[PDB]
Amino acid sequence: MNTPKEEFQDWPIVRIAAHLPDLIVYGHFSPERPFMDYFDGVLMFVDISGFTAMTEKFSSAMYMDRGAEQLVEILNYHISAIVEKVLIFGGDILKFAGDALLALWRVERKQLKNIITVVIKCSLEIHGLFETRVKIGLAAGHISMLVFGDETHSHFLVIGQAVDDVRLAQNMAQMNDVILSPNCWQLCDRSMIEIESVPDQRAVKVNFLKPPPNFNFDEFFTKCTTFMHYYPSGEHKNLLRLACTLKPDPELEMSLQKYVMESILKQIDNKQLQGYLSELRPVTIVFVNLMFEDQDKAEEIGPAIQDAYMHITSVLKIFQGQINKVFMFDKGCSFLCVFGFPGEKVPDELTHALECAMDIFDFCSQVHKIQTVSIGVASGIVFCGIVGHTVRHEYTVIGQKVNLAARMMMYYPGIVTCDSVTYNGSNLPAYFFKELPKKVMKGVADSGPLYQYWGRTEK
Numbered sequence: 001m002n003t004p005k006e007e008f009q010d011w012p013i014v015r016i017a018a019h020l021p022d023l024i025v026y027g028h029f030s031p032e033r034p035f036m037d038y039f040d041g042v043l044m045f046v047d048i049s050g051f052t053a054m055t056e057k058f059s060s061a062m063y064m065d066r067g068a069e070q071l072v073e074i075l076n077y078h079i080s081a082i083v084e085k086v087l088i089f090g091g092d093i094l095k096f097a098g099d100a101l102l103a104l105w106r107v108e109r110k111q112l113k114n115i116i117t118v119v120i121k122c123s124l125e126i127h128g129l130f131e132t133r134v135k136i137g138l139a140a141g142h143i144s145m146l147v148f149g150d151e152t153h154s155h156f157l158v159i160g161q162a163v164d165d166v167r168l169a170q171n172m173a174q175m176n177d178v179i180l181s182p183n184c185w186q187l188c189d190r191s192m193i194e195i196e197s198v199p200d201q202r203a204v205k206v207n208f209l210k211p212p213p214n215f216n217f218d219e220f221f222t223k224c225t226t227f228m229h230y231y232p233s234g235e236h237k238n239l240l241r242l243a244c245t246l247k248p249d250p251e252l253e254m255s256l257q258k259y260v261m262e263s264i265l266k267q268i269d270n271k272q273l274q275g276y277l278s279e280l281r282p283v284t285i286v287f288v289n290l291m292f293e294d295q296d297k298a299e300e301i302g303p304a305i306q307d308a309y310m311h312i313t314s315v316l317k318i319f320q321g322q323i324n325k326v327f328m329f330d331k332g333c334s335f336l337c338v339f340g341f342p343g344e345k346v347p348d349e350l351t352h353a354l355e356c357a358m359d360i361f362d363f364c365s366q367v368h369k370i371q372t373v374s375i376g377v378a379s380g381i382v383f384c385g386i387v388g389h390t391v392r393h394e395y396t397v398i399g400q401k402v403n404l405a406a407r408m409m410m411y412y413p414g415i416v417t418c419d420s421v422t423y424n425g426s427n428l429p430a431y432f433f434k435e436l437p438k439k440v441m442k443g444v445a446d447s448g449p450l451y452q453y454w455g456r457t458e459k
Contacts, residue, residue: 017241022242040143046134052075055383096388118221143159182202279383289329289334374413377418412452
């Protein structure tokens with residue numbers, strides 16, 4: 001009696017799970033919104049802006065109309081390597097957002113110390129990939145999770161001091177650096193490492209991982225796997241993710257698909273070509289920032305984000321805008337919204353982005369606990385595609401206009417701002433805008449004139 005090999009692990013549910021972290025895939029939580037949960041862990045933030053900066057290189061005519069294809073190929077080659085390191089070291093890639101990868105090692109509190117060592121080693125091996133670059137911030141401590149959305153769509157955020165800390169840490173780093181948050185440094189095993197102080201900060205820089213003379217990392221890591229719920233093991237020790245082993249389960253797939261864009265699900269269902277979403281396309285970015293007095297307290301900010309989300313989604317529906325990403329910044333929550341800019345009725349479409357931005361601004365400004373709303377609007381060619389590893393990847397939009405809208409919302413807080421392409425293209429009367437002072441914006445290559453969208457009336 002024969003014993004044929006299994007092969008089939010390519011079900012729709014498995015394909016969907018590539019686009020999500022274990023936090024969600026194995027989360028099994030209520031479908032009430034907002035939903036909040038609380039745990040501890042170690043966070044890694046890998047700035048890959050040095051890679052995403054290649055949108056400019058691949059815009060050249062030299063690439064003969066295959067710039068998007070070449071860009072996705074070379075990005076996925078390098079990012080895949082980073083992903084594999086994270087996954088092999090036991091981490092959960094949470095999101096590809098803000099030209100960074102955010103990863104989590106969720107553990108009980110007593111194990112933070114040893115898991116930090118695992119994460120430092122991982123960080124150093126990541127840098128080791130690109131010798132002949134990236135910046136890494138590490139944090140540890142209390143983490144909160146927020147899931148928000150409606151009956152068809154779901155999003156999540158992780159929130160809290162450790163989340164604030166991990167982006168602050170990475171922001172202090174130079175290329176090739178690993179920076180620890182103050183709490184990470186307080187919680188770590190100091191015998192493992194040599195650090196130096198970072199001027200005007202309580203964060204530290206890892207100079208070396210130099211363990212004690214009898215230390216054996218492989219045996220240490222094996223001990224640490226006791227605390228890693230989903231580390232692939234036994235029969236499945238050859239897999240990068242346990243999620244590769246998911247079987248059909250209609251209830252679970254119904255819940256997981258809500259996190260994934262419909263055009264992605266179309267590809268997953270083999271109803272559109274696998275390369276259709278890798279493209280340089282003209283869009284309008286509407287980047288919405290919501291600031292809160294207490295950005296670490298899920299209990300306060302979670303209802304506000306849910307209420308904002310319900311309104312945002314309703315306004316986007318009217319114009320098939322999409323939410324590409326939601327992620328945290330230092331004082332609040334950012335929504336990266338995307339509109340088609342096909343240019344079949346240029347004044348009409350850019351007018352719509354602007355009107356949607358103002359609607360969102362007006363509504364979110366009256367949501368309890370939202371202290372400041374800021375919206376940046378930029379229009380132009382952007383790279384779109386599914387970026388990451390076969391087993392862990394996400395649809396992403398990258399480019400100078402994404403970065404411009406992001407910076408506008410931070411350097412011109414409390415208002416709706418637009419670039420020159422958007423202003424000019426709208427054909428709206430000029431008195432609906434205000435020409436703004438020029439600001440030198442970190443990371444922005446000469447913005448052109450910027451404008452406030454003042455709106456229809458003098459007021």
